[PDB]
Symmetry: C5
Subunit: 103 residues, 5 copies
């Protein structure tokens, strides 16, 4: 299996790594229908989403999506530095696939 | 694919943004039958609910309602500053659709 | 819907408000069969339970009972001030229906 | 309903109370097959488990087993003083039935 | 039942203990399809995974895998010292079977 987020990210099409090395600036979450999603920003203006669960997701991703929103909330509240995000870049805002935290 | 809470809120009928820029003053939650809900207030008196789950909600909103109560509770306990709430204004108290946190 | 815990509590028979304005002094929880419950106390000695789920609970209350035990545990560990409890007084210990927290 | 952990403990066969009045010294958790369990120790060497869910457990206990493991982990991480444990003493390590925490 | 992680680990083939006595240096998690996993590293370079749930896992392990990722996340964020990991060393990175925290 992959040993780091960059190698993991590269197993997929339409992805890229963003390097942030910064805490999350804002955390937004919605329960409105068809927009049950989270959005984060950084102070540089960079904006990312956790997508609404949909037909593009296989069943094993469903729990992991819920976990990622849990992770972003507590990272935001603890001011944890985000190192990198692996994102799909065929969505706007780019859609989070993976996160690494260090330092 | 909204990039922020204001653009997300605009997608729905009967909504408005409240700008708080303040921590939650009180957090209330109930397990009483038919009132399985949360209520928050701010020191300015503004009061908001997370509605009891009902037929006005589609299935995908159910998990998101539970997450929102989780979010309000930890926001309260950590004294996190709430930036904005998107709410439905055809309920009293106004009903939360989305939350943003930022300092 | 209710604006606050007092109005909510008044919707139910056999309830009363206890005003504590204090942190939880002790937190007890059990996984023993037929006693899957939590008990809290306050410094003055007053004792309260989250009841074992039973036939008196409608289905929607089950998730809320689990949430309430989560809330009590974190409130205890963070030394959060409990403002009020709405309780059923036809049980001993009195059974928690709702909680408000405020400083 | 029992008022405290000691009275709760007394309702079961093969139980005893341990009075620790100490934080948890170590926390161990396993996802290995047939050993999906947690083990804790105290400085005095006393060791306790949350048992693997099994046919000795009724359905209502399943959620409470999961909650107990959640409680032990966060108690460990926050250095929360554990007052008493009610345990089944017909297992080794003794198997946790209930926990109380007080300052 | 085992009294500690070393004895637990020794019940399984293809395992070893690693003694770290250090906090986690980095935490990575993924919701990408077929790579719903977590990876942690230590400052010495040691790298470990929580494997993607698969056919090698029995049903009882599923909840425990989710719990373990919860544990690693919070251990990372709180800088909790990890004492030992029990791992399967027939996978690269080595796959976590159990964790102990002390000190």
């Amino acid at each position: 299996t992959p040993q780091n987020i960059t190698d993991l990210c590269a197993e997929y099409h339409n992805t890229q790594i963003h390097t942030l090395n910064d805490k999350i600036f804002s955390y937004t979450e919605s329960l409105a229908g068809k927009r049950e999603m989270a959005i984060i920003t950084f102070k540089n203006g960079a904006t990312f989403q956790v997508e609404v669960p949909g037909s593009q997701h296989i069943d094993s991703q469903k729990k992991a999506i819920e976990r990622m929103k849990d992770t972003l909330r507590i990272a935001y509240l603890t001011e944890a530095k985000v190192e990198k995000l692996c994102v799909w870049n065929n969505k706007t805002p780019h859609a989070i696939a993976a996160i690494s935290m260090a330092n």
